[PDB]
Amino acid sequence: TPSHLSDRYELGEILGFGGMSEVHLARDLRDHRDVAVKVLRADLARDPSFYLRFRREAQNAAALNHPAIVAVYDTGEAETPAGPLPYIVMEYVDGVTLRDIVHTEGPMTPKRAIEVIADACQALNFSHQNGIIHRDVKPANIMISATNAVKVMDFGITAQYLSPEQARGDSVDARSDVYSLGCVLYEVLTGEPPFTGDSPVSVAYQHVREDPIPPSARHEGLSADLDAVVLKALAKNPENRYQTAAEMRADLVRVHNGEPPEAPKVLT
Ligand SMILES: Nc1ncnc2c1ncn2[C@@H]1O[C@H](COP(=O)(O)OP(=O)(O)OP(O)(O)=S)[C@@H](O)[C@H]1O
Ligand SMILES: [Mn+2]
């Protein structure tokens, strides 16, 4: 895989592999800065499907300026000994994604989890302000730096993180992001997503039919007040969940600070 492509970026160590890309720590030679480069895998690149899937999700990833949002810098596709390799250049986050944490460290401590997801609401909310719906909220798209800073990425453009309105092919709004962010919060508190199945279609059915089991019913140490917040964000009807990311944050802040949520009590 490439030592130095674009003649502008010198790719370094692999920071990690995602479902369809290797992410390198490159060095921007022109602006003299450390940067992250997400390159489509060479094996998946000789497959027009993935090539186009990456190429689409590359020019469509929103570039926003926010301390909690990963800034996109460049996009392109250089010729390498493996054909073209589409790539996206972005802010280097020294840390891991929530997925990495869930599958290595395990379930986060409630207060820390509440903080992380509260900080993600800040980014989601700012995005909503600019009229941009993320519509792809999941653990692998939310990062935590070495300085505990929350960095969210891939705005614009995942089987068990989609909203009932997404699973029905309907429209998508701020409330849709709330539901998905709620799924991330659920998993990060308990250890597993709200809904799991033997096939994507199974999970999609569970999303728009089956109710979520209270987080505390799945993991030890989770307050009932936390159930209220989580489960409200997982409400099937958009009008039942939080209307804005700020609203959800306002409620996480309360639970965090040992205050009663404005979310309907989870009873029986
Ligand atoms: N902006 C970044 N800065 C530093 N490291 C990153 C950055 N983005 C991703 N990484 C690392 O690369 C790994 C994979 O990144 P992903 O975004 O999950 O790749 P992906 O192919 O888009 O996977 P998906 O989103 O599930 S399709 C992560 O676990 C991180 O360690
Ligand atoms: Mn991705």
Side-chain angles (χ1 to χ4, degrees), residues 22-26 28-29 31-32 34-42:
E22 53 178 5
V23 192
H24 284 261
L25 165 63
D28 189 1
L29 295 166
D31 294 39
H32 300 286
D34 265 28
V35 88
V37 172
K38 188 185 287 181
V39 202
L40 176 65
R41 297 214 293 264

Side-chain angles (χ1 to χ4, degrees), residues 19-26 28-29 31-32 34-54 57-78 80-167 169-191 193-204 206-208 210-260:
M20 63 145 172
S21 79
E22 53 178 5
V23 192
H24 284 261
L25 165 63
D28 189 1
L29 295 166
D31 294 39
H32 300 286
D34 265 28
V35 88
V37 172
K38 188 185 287 181
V39 202
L40 176 65
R41 297 214 293 264
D43 53 291
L44 300 160
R46 304 215 175 164
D47 185 322
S49 321
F50 285 85
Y51 183 98
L52 290 156
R53 186 158 301 118
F54 193 99
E57 297 195 353
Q59 274 191 182
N60 276 191
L64 297 160
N65 198 63
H66 192 79
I69 294 167
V70 176
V72 182
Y73 303 141
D74 199 30
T75 295
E77 42 165 299
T80 70
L85 288 177
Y87 73 90
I88 176 176
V89 178
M90 40 166 50
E91 186 195 315
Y92 167 62
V93 188
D94 173 28
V96 304
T97 78
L98 287 198
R99 181 172 64 183
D100 312 330
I101 296 174
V102 172
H103 296 102
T104 58
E105 183 199 291
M108 296 187 75
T109 71
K111 297 188 79 59
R112 186 79 202 100
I114 292 165
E115 287 157 31
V116 179
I117 279 79
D119 274 26
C121 283
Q122 214 106 285
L124 280 173
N125 196 75
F126 172 84
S127 178
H128 298 164
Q129 292 294 135
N130 289 251
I132 296 170
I133 306 304
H134 188 123
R135 85 230 321 277
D136 194 16
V137 181
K138 50 192 193 66
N141 281 332
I142 293 163
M143 288 198 72
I144 307 175
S145 72
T147 65
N148 279 14
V150 172
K151 296 286 180 175
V152 190
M153 64 190 161
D154 293 5
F155 289 77
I157 306 162
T158 198
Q160 53 208 183
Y161 306 104
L162 85 175
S163 64
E165 57 266 46
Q166 283 186 345
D170 307 333
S171 67
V172 172
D173 54 357
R175 310 199 219 87
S176 183
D177 279 346
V178 169
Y179 182 94
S180 299
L181 199 274
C183 293
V184 184
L185 176 62
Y186 185 121
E187 182 177 319
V188 84
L189 281 166
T190 60
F195 310 106
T196 52
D198 287 308
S199 67
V201 189
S202 166
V203 194
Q206 277 166 286
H207 274 287
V208 65
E210 281 184 28
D211 280 292
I213 301 88
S216 70
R218 276 200 177 188
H219 191 63
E220 201 64 65
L222 306 178
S223 55
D225 281 355
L226 187 62
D227 295 303
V229 176
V230 174
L231 291 185
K232 168 171 179 172
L234 292 177
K236 297 294 169 299
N237 201 300
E239 321 299 324
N240 303 328
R241 53 180 89 121
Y242 299 103
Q243 302 308 271
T244 58
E247 201 166 310
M248 179 163 187
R249 184 177 182 282
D251 217 17
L252 285 167
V253 169
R254 292 182 196 103
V255 181
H256 182 263
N257 299 322
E259 293 174 37

